[model samples]
Target: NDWHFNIGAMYEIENVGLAEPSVYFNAANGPWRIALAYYQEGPVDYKRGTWFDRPELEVHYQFLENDDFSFGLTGGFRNYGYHYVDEPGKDTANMQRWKIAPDWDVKLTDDLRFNGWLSMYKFANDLNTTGYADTRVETETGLQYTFNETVALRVNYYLERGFNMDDSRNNGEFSTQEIRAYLPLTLGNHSVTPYTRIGLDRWSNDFNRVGLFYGYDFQNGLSVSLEYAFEWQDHDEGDSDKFHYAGVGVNYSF
Candidate 1:
């Protein structure tokens, strides 16, 4: 059995606001893999608040594989809902979506690599309201260059587009994009990475974010990582309404 599990948590540690805990599991055999995940989000107002989110399930199939490249496809579904503090099954504001994606990885050179994916989604809600259905597309592209055994750099771009496919007779579409760059250094069983990101959308100005990541491996296929991030606007607000968050994650494979 080829299986793995990951559990992680993210928190706002500046003034302390929110916490997110998530778990992911996958089982794979040959070219097929099935995955499940649960993510929880809560508020931390001196005390802990309720955590609720929709669970996700996905299946992936590998189509081709070689020494330098690989190709795969994925189908997934997620339901968006909210629950009470102690009552977990009572779902409100129910929404669901199904998505399919084609993903690939390529090695352009001995020290350079590229990876990307394109996904399409059909989202709908059960509420008796107009304009509750839409079609969305998501794209991701990334490039990596390894400078040596201890240093590497990567750049990534992501895009999301939404098309109107609902009632109310509206013919409008929205799009957004994000760009990120990362530099990592590895020393023995420990690594440190620093990254910068920017978000682009029609409704909002470009928001900038920066982060530092650190990780350690224990040589038993178990690893722990910590991440710290700060986000702010690039223009008027600057760092006034800045947000700070931290994440802790653990991964283990047997």
Candidate 2:
């Protein structure tokens, strides 16, 4: 029973907009995994969109296997669409992002394991409002200590940077740092996984965003999740926006 093959549709709200009819497919068991998903939604404002559609592709593969450690590559891409334009001549736009991560879960002792992903995203067309050809690199590393089958603690560090070197796109170089943790609870046929992530950033400018995610996994492969993401934006010019988002999604595995 894989975790992605059960849930099919959900309604989610992000920033100031709503995304409905989110769907996931393509899952099975083997050494390689793949998935395709899509979402239809409306934007927060003219800065975002009145209506939009997004599609994504995900893939993962393991390269090595051993008793103490393992390494794998994870890659994904997303397409973004929007309705209005403030920059002139930009109506509906498209941007794709992909990343290759060298992943590892190493057993440091009977109760401790090092696990996480170090990845990057090269996103074309500043489809949002950043005015930059958004390419970013991110790294997350966490230390996990297990107390038993139903309890564990993880502490993680996150780092990220923007690709624009000059002010060409009006979005100068930016960087960020974050810390995250996760807790899990299980009782018979139901399981709940909750996580918290906090972050800070500095580039030619500075900003921050924090996120919380909860996942419910049914023992047979059907699961649903909700995510709350809040971002606090601050610029050197003393301008910013603080907002919250609530989104739900479903996944299945076969």
Candidate 3:
């Protein structure tokens, strides 16, 4: 077995009023993988470049693997930081999340593949900001067809719901669904992908999402990527919502 490690730095901007930086490290040996990450995810003024904003850890194990199929389990913990608009440098409550997930992959043909995952997480309101514990369930699936080294198509579906609350009268029961398609291309060490997505619920609508991704890999185990996306949704009850995102990252593998 061989072991390798990756280190990366990332910056992202979201319409939700977050513009932050993330730094992470990951390593894998045989069937085991570990990841550590820290984030300054908040308003630009609140980031303060402090590592205490949000931190995460994950451990994963591959239980089964073969030429065409593989299964794995992962567990993780994250501290979620809360930030408010115009509340720069203000003290606020934070939350913690414990998560466990099972993932599987299958190859249906030499050129087609499928993968999916299920996750359950517990969110603790230790700070008692909301006074209720949250439990979340997430499911995701993807199918991919390879047309060659330079062209491929991928489709994905995702669903998520939170319990111990439903949002009808405000019990925290929130749910969302997403379906998306990607046209990915790889040429030597360069990659490009453009995607479209559909959303359901408060994000309802049609042709609501579009995104573009580009990446480059150098011969020295260094890589860089850039991504941008724009989305719009209308709820009729409220004015339309517009969202935009841009992200950049650089990494090195050893």
Q: What is the TM-score of each candidate against the true structure?
A: 0.80, 0.75, 0.85
lDDT for each candidate structure? 0.75, 0.69, 0.81
Model 3 ranges with Cα > 4 A deviation: 46-52, 83-91, 127-133, 165-171, 202-207, 235-239
Cα RMSDs of all predictions?
4.5, 4.6, 4.1
Per-residue error for 83 in candidate 2, Å, reads 2.6
Alpha-carbon lDDT of model 1? 0.75
Off by over 4 Å in 2: 1-7, 15-21, 44-48, 85-89, 125-130, 165-172, 200-215, 227-242
Instruction: List, residue by residue over 120-155, the lDDT tens digit for candidate 3.
Output: 998875434433337778887899989998999989
lDDT per residue (tens digit) for residues 157-249 in model 2: 888877753354545456778787776655444456666666554555534555666677776667787777777765457566777778777
Q: Which pairs of residues collide in candidate 2?
A: 4-251, 4-252, 4-253, 5-252, 5-253, 6-252
Q: Which 10 residues in a row give candidate 3 its minimum summed lDDT? A: 199-208
Candidates ranked by TM-score, best first?
Answer: 3, 1, 2
- Residue 174, model 1: Cα distance from true site in angstroms: 4.1
